[PDB]
Amino acid sequence: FGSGAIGYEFDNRYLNNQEMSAVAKQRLTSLP
Amino acid sequence: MVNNINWVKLPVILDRLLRHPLLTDLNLETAIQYTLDFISAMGLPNVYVDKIETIDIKEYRGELPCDLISINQVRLHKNGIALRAMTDNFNAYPTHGEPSFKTQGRVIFTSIKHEKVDISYKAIMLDDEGLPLIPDNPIFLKTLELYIKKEWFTILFDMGKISPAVLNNTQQEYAFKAGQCNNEFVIPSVSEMEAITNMWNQLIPRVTEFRRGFKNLGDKEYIRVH
Numbered sequence A: 001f002g003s004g005a006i007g008y009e010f011d012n013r014y015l016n017n018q019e020m021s022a023v024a025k026q027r028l029t030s031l032p
Numbered sequence B: 001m002v003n004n005i006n007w008v009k010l011p012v013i014l015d016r017l018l019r020h021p022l023l024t025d026l027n028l029e030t031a032i033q034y035t036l037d038f039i040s041a042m043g044l045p046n047v048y049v050d051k052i053e054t055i056d057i058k059e060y061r062g063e064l065p066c067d068l069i070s071i072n073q074v075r076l077h078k079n080g081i082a083l084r085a086m087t088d089n090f091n092a093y094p095t096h097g098e099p100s101f102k103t104q105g106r107v108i109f110t111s112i113k114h115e116k117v118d119i120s121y122k123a124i125m126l127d128d129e130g131l132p133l134i135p136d137n138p139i140f141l142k143t144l145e146l147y148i149k150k151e152w153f154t155i156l157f158d159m160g161k162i163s164p165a166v167l168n169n170t171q172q173e174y175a176f177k178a179g180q181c182n183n184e185f186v187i188p189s190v191s192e193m194e195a196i197t198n199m200w201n202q203l204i205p206r207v208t209e210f211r212r213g214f215k216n217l218g219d220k221e222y223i224r225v226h
Helices: A007-022 B012-017 B028-042 B138-159 B164-186 B190-200
Strands: B007-009 B049-057 B070-076 B101-103 B107-110 B115-123 B133-135
Touching: B012 B028, B012 B138, B028 B138, B028 B164, B049 B107, B107 B115, B133 B138, B138 B164
Parallel strands: none
Antiparallel strands: B007 B133, B049 B115, B070 B115, B101 B107
């Protein structure tokens, strides 16, 4: 059948947690 | 301070913040509170307006002006002799000297019963509205802008709406400009280093400048030829 309001929010939340991991590897380094 | 403090209204800081699309929900109301927190935390005595008022002391107590923020000196009106500080624990209290003062709220507590005193103090400069007025210094303005951007991003970082790398950059950039803004307002002009020169170079040391209003502090010391 079909209804995609919980498939959407779980997929949108998995890409959020994957994006959250990617921005936690960002470093503005502090050697010369 | 080397540069003069030209006054501008608080919404000039909001042209600068709302250039940033994450700071577009900022207000005048939020700009008012974060300015006064910033003005206080820096503690620059050049941002305040110097005022002098004569108040009368009724019995070891006098009512202080409404705009008062910090007292420069209190002195007597008839003599001009300055008052130092109340270290007495039992001041206006009888059992069965050098005059003093003490201030807690809107009341000053002196050592003299019935006397008029001059109070030289600092207030905040206001507008036609009763609102703060900030320097147009683009160093002051930039680091007040970075102050509000760091308080707004700290909320957004607690919410999870900002990267920890984004807040770490704002916390770093505010930290540099806050020292540059401190040194911009503290480091004397050429005309204030001359008064600093005359105080520093004194063959007969002048050690009673508090009795005057520090009037003769930066005066030059002259020695006769013999």
